Amino acid sequence: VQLVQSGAEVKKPGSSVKVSCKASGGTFNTYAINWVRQAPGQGLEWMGRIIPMFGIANYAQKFQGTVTFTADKSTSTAYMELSSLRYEDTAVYYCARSAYYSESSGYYLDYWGQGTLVTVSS
Amino acid sequence: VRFPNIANLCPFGEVFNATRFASVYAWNRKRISNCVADYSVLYNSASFSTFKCYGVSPTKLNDLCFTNVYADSFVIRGDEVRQIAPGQTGKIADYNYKLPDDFTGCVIAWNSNNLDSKVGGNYNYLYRLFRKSNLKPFERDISTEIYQAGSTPCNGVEGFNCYFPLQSYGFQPTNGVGYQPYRVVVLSFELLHAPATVCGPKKST
Amino acid sequence: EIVLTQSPGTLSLSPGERATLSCRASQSVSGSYLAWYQQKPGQAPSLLIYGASSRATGIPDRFSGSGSGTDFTLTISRLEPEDFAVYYCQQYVNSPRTFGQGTKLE
Numbered sequence: 001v002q003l004v005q006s007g008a009e010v011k012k013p014g015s016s017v018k019v020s021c022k023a024s025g026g027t028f029n030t031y032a033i034n035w036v037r038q039a040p041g042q043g044l045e046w047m048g049r050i051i052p053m054f055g056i057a058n059y060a061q062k063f064q065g066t067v068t069f070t071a072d073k074s075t076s077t078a079y080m081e082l083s084s085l086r087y088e089d090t091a092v093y094y095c096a097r098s099a100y101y102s103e104s105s106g107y108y109l110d111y112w113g114q115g116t117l118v119t120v121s122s
Numbered sequence: 123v124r125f126p127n128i129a130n131l132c133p134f135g136e137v138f139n140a141t142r143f144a145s146v147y148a149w150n151r152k153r154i155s156n157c158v159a160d161y162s163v164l165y166n167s168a169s170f171s172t173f174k175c176y177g178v179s180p181t182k183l184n185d186l187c188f189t190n191v192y193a194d195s196f197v198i199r200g201d202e203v204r205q206i207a208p209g210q211t212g213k214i215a216d217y218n219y220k221l222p223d224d225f226t227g228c229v230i231a232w233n234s235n236n237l238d239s240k241v242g243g244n245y246n247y248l249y250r251l252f253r254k255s256n257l258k259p260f261e262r263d264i265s266t267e268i269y270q271a272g273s274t275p276c277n278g279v280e281g282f283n284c285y286f287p288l289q290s291y292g293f294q295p296t297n298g299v300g301y302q303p304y305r306v307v308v309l310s311f312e313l314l315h316a317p318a319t320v321c322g323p324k325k326s327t
Numbered sequence: 328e329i330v331l332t333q334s335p336g337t338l339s340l341s342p343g344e345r346a347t348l349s350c351r352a353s354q355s356v357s358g359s360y361l362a363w364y365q366q367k368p369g370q371a372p373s374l375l376i377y378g379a380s381s382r383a384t385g386i387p388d389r390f391s392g393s394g395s396g397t398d399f400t401l402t403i404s405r406l407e408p409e410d411f412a413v414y415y416c417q418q419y420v421n422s423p424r425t426f427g428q429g430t431k432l433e
Contacts, residue, residue, distance in 0.1 A: 030245045030290060034424070044364070044372065044415055046424035049279065051286075054266045058278035060423035094371055098419075102251050102269075102285035107419040108362040112371035274421040281421040282358045 003027070003078075005095055005113040010122045013085045019116050021078035021095035023071075028052040031097040033071060033078045034109055037063075038092040040117075047093075050078065051100055082118065090119045123327050125187040125318035132157035132320070134164070137193045138230075143238070143305050145248045146196040146218040147288060148264055154191035158321040161185065170232045171304070172203055177226030178311060184228075187318035192310035194219070197238055197247045199291055201300045203231045206308065216256035217263075218249055221308070228309040238293060238303040245290040247303065252287055260310075329354055331397075331416050331427040339411055339431040348401035348430050350416035357420045361398040363390075364415040366429070372415055376401065 005021035021033065033052065037045040048059035050069040057069035068081040078095055093116045096109035132154050144150035161184045164170065178184045198206070198214060205212040208225040215221070221229075238244060252269040265287070268276040272283025280286055293303045334349045350361070359379035364372035374383045380392045390410075393400035401414060416427035 026242070043428050044366075044417070044426040046417075046426065048423075051266075054288075056266055062423075096371075100280055100286045102287075102289050105285075106377060107280055107360070107424075108374065108377045108417070109364070109372075110374055112373065115371055272421070277421065277423075279421070279423070281419050282360050284421055 001027075001111065003095055003097070003111060003113040005078075005093075006116045008122055009116070009118045011082075011085050011118055011120075013087065013120055016084055017082050017118055019078075019080040019082075019093055019095070021080075021113050021116075023052075023076040023078055023097075025076065027097055028071065028073065028076050030099070030101065031110075032100040033069075034096050034098050035067075035069065035080050036094040036096060036109070036112075038094060038115070039088070040090070040092065044094075047080075049098065049100075052078070085118065085120070090117075092117045123187065123324075124316060125322050125324075125327065127326050128156050128158055128321045130157040132160055132191075134160055134193075137195060138164075138307055140195065143195050143197045143234075145246075146198050146214055147248055147250045147262070149194050149196045149219050149262055152193045152195075154193055154320055156319055156321075158323050159185075159188070159191070160323065164228075164230065170230050172229065172231035172306075174207065174230075175228040176208055177313070178228070180228065185322050185324055186311075186313060187315035187322045188311050188320035189314035189317040190312045191320045194308040194310065195305065196308075197234065197291075197303050197305050198249070199293075199300070200233075200302050200304050203229075203304050203306065206306065213251065214249065217251070217253045218257070219308075220257045220259045220261065222259040225310070226313050227311050229306065230309060231304045231306040233302060234305045235293075235295070235302045238305065239295045239297070240293075241295055243292045243294050244303075245292055247291045247293070248288040249291060250287050251289045252285060329356065329418050329420055329422045329425055331418060331425060333416060333427040333430045335430050336428070337432065339413075339433045341411070342406055344405055346401075346403050346406060348403075348414060349399040350397065350401075350427055351399050352397040352418060355396040356394075356398060356418050359394060359396075359398060360418060360420045361392075361394060362417050362419070363392060363398075363401050364417065365410075366413040366415060368412065375414065 035047040050057040052071040099106040276284035362377040366372040389404035
């Protein structure tokens, strides 16, 4: 219901960072977590989804090998790791939950976190 | 007759009275080996709604010598307890737990509505809605590979004609008896009296 | 890949009443598996509709989606003062959940 995440990362270029989207109770149980890159002044890009229960993370062709999705079953927290800060990597990283189950057939992002902006500095 | 006698009591209490039971697809198997058999506790308890013993009879004729007793525990919905019989077909039978047509054992099932239903629904128990093929007798599929239902490659993500193979039961405390959980402890016997590793409780030989 | 092209690129000019927000795809969206997301400025997009026309929880039914195949409509009965955000299109039909460019971006 509330997915408060990290704030802003003072990451000098080439330095890695890990995001910390926090799932409320029962979020992980029946819902996957999706990450959406929002580069400042562009459209929403779908980085991929992490299914916490079975530890399954699948990424798009663009972001493969550059980003890692992790979630902690205990403490119900979602994490995303950036391999290094490439010059174009500065973006507002979002987190949102989608049903992965066959019956619901929704696979759409119901609720979203506030946003985590990475940049060369602050 | 020729059975040895092991003072070690068989841990059927461990299997039946366990705190947490597994899902049907990931059916948990325990091997009951080298212990004297307790079967009358099961027979006389009578709180086990289904006590269907194929092969061996459930009317106090199972004081037999067994070389190997395999215990399988899973939690399923009430409407599919009939499904897990030898030579029966359904979703649970062909995708989650298949019983051999020559099953010589006891399908034991009782209500766990208080224990295994949680307010707001219990989604801890899964089941395989779709799978490429029917499951073979005594085979556990733990694969999470996205089921294909269309020409489009699933690419690892779900969508049209691509579904997550597993689905949640979702037992609710106020729900129909058909929709309430039944813990099932399938007991698979081998009925070999010559090795008789699983001791019978009768007087020795 | 299923790409999406939102046609009315800029409608944040305070338009009046009905707006025919559109989105079309190279291969027809199958199963009406499209959703609309409202990105209010300074905030994260909130689901506005899903499916072809299935309205979201806590959203007024005035927002509808008249989509056939690819969902190429999003109709707001009145453009209320609050509702002047950037509405997005997303498809989940077996692709990397590609989005649109946005429709009411100042």
